[PDB]
């Protein structure tokens, strides 16, 4: 059931960490992918694979899991992305076990059916990040590590007071999301709880003033970008917003809606705009991820189930293709040795299908219709315009900068005058690009099949803001 | 399901020629592409002959996947498939010895399939899908020869302007979704009838739709991106300027006629922008010394004509000019491509001349095209342009000054078309062309294109003569029509227009054979050569300042991270101020101890 798929990447990452060899990670990620796909199919509803086990009877803690429409496809997305990062990695530092551990942690994070288990995974996801950052790459590794870790922790620890207030002030007997949702929080008490939630979730969203931890994180990881891909998967902020933040304290969200929508708009614009000024791949991709998170948070905060479903779909797909771009930059490093955009121009003539892979990925990034980005982008646009037209319009002065930075990077990296000549593709990279394009096309052209579980949650939690 | 094959064929073709692609002989990619285009023309003609078609598939909740094949969609489909088959043959001939044959024809197939996705649409998001797919294929083909950085930034600029237009499109669609909640042109029309609500918001949505149309069809101010499409090969420029990627601007208005007709002010604005676009294109065409640019500015002028037609509510008239133009401009481009194929890609005018005798079957193509564009009294271009000139007065909103404006534009089109023909084919010789100027299979579809250009013609004729296009175009969409007409005086106007066009032709003849270019004309030709100094201003206050702001926001982000650093440093400094509290003098520790204990004892009350 759910716990099996949640733990499989954890146990495989352990067996790669202490045990040998690297190859165990490829087959482990494949087994995870197949299990998460099987869980994604035949999904009846939320209780699909429900798990309930007691841990602290007195304190009220229970292992609580289940596959919602959201948990299923996010499991599938994570399994797929980490499998891709597992085959193509080329890190081979024997630490892909850390990548599988982080995968399993993010799985448990998403599948949490009770508040405290979610909080536990939210705090646990910090350790592998600092680990694969510190000992596996980067010159400013220590400083970026401290910055990112301290930001996450300064956000997270007061959220413990927030969750303690949310449980105690509501008289909810347990930490179960069912029970906690059964007992609402009052005015000027849901206010403070939501404020403590919004700090920890915005600094991890990321929004504009709280994003300063993102570029240093992405720069000094392993140059291959496996750690970077998993950190982009670590932008789970929006998710916690929609399921936990807003439904548990909409009274404060009433005053905070405009502020948060504005932050999402300006964050998206700022990221997609600065990404033009980026002189390296890590900076560009970090600012792009910031823009996408701004869009997703905008869609969720706008109410308007259109916007919410768009935000979540865009979140999953952006995680997928941003992780793909990170791994691609790492592979081009391993074959070349640099991530600068100006140098190494002739790539296109030497790289037959790596050019096409990078192009498909950047197209999915700028949100091209037919690929994964556009459904979420447009649904979020609709929902935001429903909520507040002004911030939606400003926020979508982003596709312009999206095309600008993506095309500039692609052109000056591949198109221009022939250089020395570069390796074409590796055998693992073949399956990588094939599966990447397959998933992108399937998620972009057929958004009907995916995200069907997202519609009920969207409309229910959007009507919840009403009477 | 059968209708989807029209799109699917030049997608499987694209996938074969892109993925494997070079596993084939040289002609085979073009062979497969042209064969798929032909067997798509066939299946579209067969489906239309069966009365029409509909297709609906499951998609985003509230936004399903809706394809509608009616008279209006089938019109564009037949045009695109036929001209695409002709240009595909012309590329099979024209593309030679340059790598990427398979890639090139895969781009062709993808372009065709995406344009079909555009026209076959009962829902506006599918129209947007086609929009962005055509924009991507255009970016790809314009930068076909990647080894030159210069012919990359052109497609960069093209796609950027395209995405500005696409953002306007998206916002208008969000508007017409917040209002109604349908976003399917069928039910959108069935819901827009009757008691309109919030007319301000409706006019705003239509204005944003027109903004998207401007970027797609390169109207003012977004004109500037089109000439740079000269970077791509000549058949690419033909398919972009004649049959696709610009005609979509007119097709959007033709389908949204029900929206634009209840917007009088917006339609009048469209007419004004079309007139200005025609004026700019005509005034800035002849100053260009290159064939590709002097044709691109003419494309600007002719699209201005079409948008003038669709501005006053003359939708079938705009489609008439679209038909004639898609014939004769494709003719011009393929002729020019054959010409530079004779000179090895010389691609200049001042380095040309005296190609009349030396070029068989090509001077004829060039003369047919120049006469059709200039408005030779008995030619398709004359019928279209003067039908627009008449619809100016006959259709609503008055067309008072627009008539004389478009007439001057007809004069100027005659003049600069004669400039092109004269300066290219007559009155000197320079350069070299020994062996193989005229190819069979390039000029062979060009024969058919010249035939269609001549005889597009009489589909739409003054009411004594049969008007075939108007009854075909009105029922499918643009049903509401309120236009008067006249006779006797209408034919006096046709005669005045024909005489004016002939005077413009001979005026260009004498002025551009003269080669003297007096004082003022040199200044004017220089100004037109520099596109009336538009890009100089566009990069002055817009593009480079946006770059400066991007860099400024980068510096500001660095500064924000520096402020976070300062917070941490304040924390450490406070920490060592508190760690300084313990010096080691026991008297100090005892005093601070007793002090803290006394503070505690006071707090307890």
Coordinates of C-alpha atoms in Angstrom, one line a residue, chain A residues 61-305:
Chain A
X61 CA 0.4 11.1 16.9
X62 CA -0.5 8.5 14.3
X63 CA 1.2 7.3 11.1
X64 CA -1.6 8.5 8.7
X65 CA -1.4 8.0 5.0
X66 CA -3.6 7.8 1.9
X67 CA -3.6 8.5 -1.8
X68 CA -5.7 11.5 -2.7
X69 CA -6.0 12.6 -6.3
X70 CA -3.1 14.8 -5.4
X71 CA -1.0 12.2 -3.6
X72 CA -1.3 9.7 -6.5
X73 CA 0.0 11.9 -9.3
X74 CA 2.6 13.5 -7.1
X75 CA 3.9 10.1 -6.3
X76 CA 4.0 9.3 -10.0
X77 CA 5.8 12.6 -10.8
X78 CA 8.4 12.1 -8.0
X79 CA 9.1 8.5 -9.0
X80 CA 9.5 9.4 -12.6
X81 CA 11.8 12.4 -12.0
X82 CA 14.0 10.6 -9.5
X83 CA 14.3 7.6 -11.8
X84 CA 15.5 9.9 -14.6
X85 CA 17.9 11.5 -12.3
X86 CA 19.1 8.0 -11.2
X87 CA 19.9 6.7 -14.6
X88 CA 21.4 9.9 -16.1
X89 CA 23.1 11.1 -12.9
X90 CA 26.8 10.6 -13.8
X91 CA 27.5 11.8 -10.2
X92 CA 28.3 8.1 -9.3
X93 CA 29.8 9.4 -6.0
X94 CA 27.9 6.4 -4.5
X95 CA 25.5 9.0 -3.0
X96 CA 22.5 8.4 -5.3
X97 CA 21.3 6.6 -2.2
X98 CA 20.9 10.1 -0.8
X99 CA 18.8 11.0 -3.8
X100 CA 16.6 7.9 -3.2
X101 CA 16.3 8.7 0.5
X102 CA 15.2 12.3 -0.3
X103 CA 12.7 10.8 -2.9
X104 CA 11.1 8.6 -0.2
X105 CA 11.1 11.5 2.2
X106 CA 9.2 13.7 -0.3
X107 CA 6.8 10.8 -0.9
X108 CA 6.0 10.5 2.8
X109 CA 5.7 14.2 2.9
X110 CA 3.0 14.2 0.2
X111 CA 1.2 11.1 1.4
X112 CA 0.8 12.4 5.0
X113 CA -2.8 12.2 6.2
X114 CA -2.2 13.7 9.6
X115 CA -0.6 17.1 10.4
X116 CA 2.2 15.9 12.6
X117 CA 3.5 13.3 10.2
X118 CA 3.5 16.0 7.4
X119 CA 5.5 18.3 9.8
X120 CA 7.9 15.5 10.5
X121 CA 8.7 14.9 6.9
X122 CA 8.9 18.6 6.2
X123 CA 11.6 18.9 8.9
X124 CA 13.3 15.6 7.9
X125 CA 13.7 16.6 4.2
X126 CA 16.4 19.1 5.4
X127 CA 19.1 16.5 6.3
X128 CA 19.8 15.0 2.8
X129 CA 19.8 18.5 1.3
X130 CA 22.6 19.7 3.5
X131 CA 24.4 16.4 3.1
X132 CA 24.5 16.1 -0.7
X133 CA 25.3 19.8 -0.7
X134 CA 28.2 19.9 1.8
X135 CA 30.4 16.8 1.0
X136 CA 29.4 16.4 -2.7
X137 CA 30.3 19.7 -4.3
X138 CA 30.4 23.5 -4.3
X139 CA 33.0 26.2 -3.4
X140 CA 30.7 28.2 -1.1
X141 CA 29.1 25.0 0.0
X142 CA 29.2 25.9 3.7
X143 CA 27.8 29.4 3.3
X144 CA 25.0 28.4 0.9
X145 CA 24.2 25.4 3.2
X146 CA 23.9 27.6 6.3
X147 CA 21.8 30.2 4.4
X148 CA 19.3 27.6 3.0
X149 CA 19.2 25.5 6.1
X150 CA 18.7 28.5 8.4
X151 CA 16.0 30.0 6.2
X152 CA 14.1 26.7 6.2
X153 CA 14.5 26.2 9.9
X154 CA 13.6 29.8 10.9
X155 CA 10.4 29.2 9.0
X156 CA 9.8 25.7 10.2
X157 CA 10.3 25.9 13.9
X158 CA 7.7 28.6 14.6
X159 CA 5.3 26.5 12.5
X160 CA 5.5 24.0 15.3
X161 CA 3.9 26.6 17.6
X162 CA 1.4 27.2 14.7
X163 CA 0.4 23.6 14.5
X164 CA 0.2 23.3 18.3
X165 CA -2.1 26.3 18.4
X166 CA -4.1 24.8 15.4
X167 CA -4.7 21.5 17.3
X168 CA -5.1 22.8 20.8
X169 CA -7.3 25.9 20.2
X170 CA -9.6 23.8 18.0
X171 CA -10.1 21.0 20.6
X172 CA -9.2 18.5 18.0
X173 CA -8.5 15.2 19.8
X174 CA -5.8 14.2 17.3
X175 CA -3.4 15.5 14.7
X176 CA -5.4 13.8 12.0
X177 CA -6.2 16.0 9.0
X178 CA -9.8 14.5 9.1
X179 CA -10.2 15.5 12.8
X180 CA -8.4 18.8 12.5
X181 CA -10.6 19.8 9.5
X182 CA -13.6 18.6 11.5
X183 CA -12.9 21.3 14.1
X184 CA -12.4 24.9 12.7
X185 CA -10.2 27.6 14.3
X186 CA -11.7 30.9 15.4
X187 CA -11.0 34.5 14.4
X188 CA -7.9 36.2 15.7
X189 CA -6.7 32.7 16.6
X190 CA -6.8 31.2 13.1
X191 CA -5.1 34.5 12.2
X192 CA -1.9 33.8 14.2
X193 CA -1.9 30.1 13.2
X194 CA -2.1 31.0 9.5
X195 CA 0.6 33.7 9.9
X196 CA 3.0 31.1 11.3
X197 CA 2.0 28.8 8.5
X198 CA 2.4 31.5 5.8
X199 CA 6.0 32.4 6.9
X200 CA 7.2 28.8 6.8
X201 CA 5.4 28.1 3.5
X202 CA 6.3 31.3 1.7
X203 CA 10.0 31.1 2.6
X204 CA 9.8 27.6 1.0
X205 CA 7.3 28.6 -1.7
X206 CA 9.5 30.6 -2.6
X207 CA 8.0 34.1 -2.8
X208 CA 9.8 37.4 -3.6
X209 CA 11.4 38.6 -0.3
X210 CA 12.1 35.1 0.9
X211 CA 13.8 33.6 -2.2
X212 CA 17.4 34.6 -1.4
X213 CA 18.2 31.0 -0.3
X214 CA 17.4 29.5 -3.8
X215 CA 20.3 30.7 -6.1
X216 CA 23.1 29.8 -3.6
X217 CA 21.5 26.4 -3.0
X218 CA 21.4 25.7 -6.8
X219 CA 24.9 27.0 -7.5
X220 CA 27.1 25.0 -5.2
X221 CA 25.5 21.5 -5.4
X222 CA 27.1 18.8 -7.4
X223 CA 27.7 20.2 -10.9
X224 CA 25.6 17.4 -12.3
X225 CA 22.5 18.9 -10.7
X226 CA 21.0 15.8 -9.1
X227 CA 20.9 17.7 -5.8
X228 CA 19.5 20.7 -7.7
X229 CA 16.7 18.6 -9.2
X230 CA 15.7 17.3 -5.8
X231 CA 15.9 20.8 -4.3
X232 CA 13.5 22.0 -7.0
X233 CA 11.3 19.1 -5.9
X234 CA 11.7 20.6 -2.4
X235 CA 9.4 23.6 -3.3
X236 CA 6.4 21.8 -1.7
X237 CA 5.3 25.1 -0.1
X238 CA 2.3 25.5 -2.5
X239 CA 1.0 22.0 -1.7
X240 CA 1.1 22.6 2.1
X241 CA -0.7 25.9 1.4
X242 CA -3.6 24.4 -0.4
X243 CA -4.2 21.3 1.8
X244 CA -3.2 22.6 5.2
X245 CA -2.6 26.4 5.4
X246 CA -5.8 27.8 3.9
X247 CA -8.5 25.2 5.0
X248 CA -7.2 25.3 8.6
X249 CA -7.3 29.1 8.9
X250 CA -9.1 30.9 6.1
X251 CA -10.0 33.8 8.4
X252 CA -6.5 35.2 8.3
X253 CA -6.2 34.1 4.6
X254 CA -9.1 36.6 4.0
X255 CA -6.8 39.5 4.8
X256 CA -3.6 37.8 3.4
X257 CA -5.1 36.9 0.0
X258 CA -4.3 40.1 -1.8
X259 CA -0.8 40.3 -0.3
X260 CA 0.0 36.7 -1.2
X261 CA -1.3 37.1 -4.8
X262 CA 0.7 40.2 -5.2
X263 CA 3.8 38.4 -3.9
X264 CA 3.2 35.5 -6.3
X265 CA 2.8 37.9 -9.2
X266 CA 5.9 40.0 -8.5
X267 CA 7.9 36.8 -7.7
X268 CA 7.0 35.2 -11.1
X269 CA 7.8 38.5 -13.0
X270 CA 11.1 39.0 -11.0
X271 CA 12.3 35.5 -11.6
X272 CA 11.5 35.4 -15.3
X273 CA 13.0 38.8 -15.7
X274 CA 16.2 38.3 -13.8
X275 CA 16.6 34.9 -15.5
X276 CA 17.5 37.0 -18.6
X277 CA 20.4 38.6 -16.7
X278 CA 21.6 35.1 -15.7
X279 CA 25.1 34.4 -17.0
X280 CA 25.1 30.7 -16.0
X281 CA 22.7 27.8 -16.1
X282 CA 22.1 27.5 -12.3
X283 CA 21.1 31.1 -11.9
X284 CA 18.8 31.0 -14.8
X285 CA 17.1 27.8 -13.7
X286 CA 16.8 29.0 -10.1
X287 CA 15.0 32.2 -11.2
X288 CA 12.8 30.2 -13.5
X289 CA 11.8 27.9 -10.7
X290 CA 11.0 31.0 -8.6
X291 CA 8.8 32.3 -11.4
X292 CA 6.9 29.0 -11.7
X293 CA 6.4 28.8 -7.9
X294 CA 5.1 32.3 -8.0
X295 CA 2.6 31.3 -10.7
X296 CA 1.5 28.2 -8.7
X297 CA 1.0 30.1 -5.5
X298 CA -0.9 32.7 -7.4
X299 CA -3.2 30.1 -8.8
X300 CA -3.8 28.5 -5.4
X301 CA -4.3 31.8 -3.5
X302 CA -6.8 33.1 -6.0
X303 CA -9.5 30.8 -4.9
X304 CA -11.2 30.0 -8.1
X305 CA -10.7 26.2 -8.5

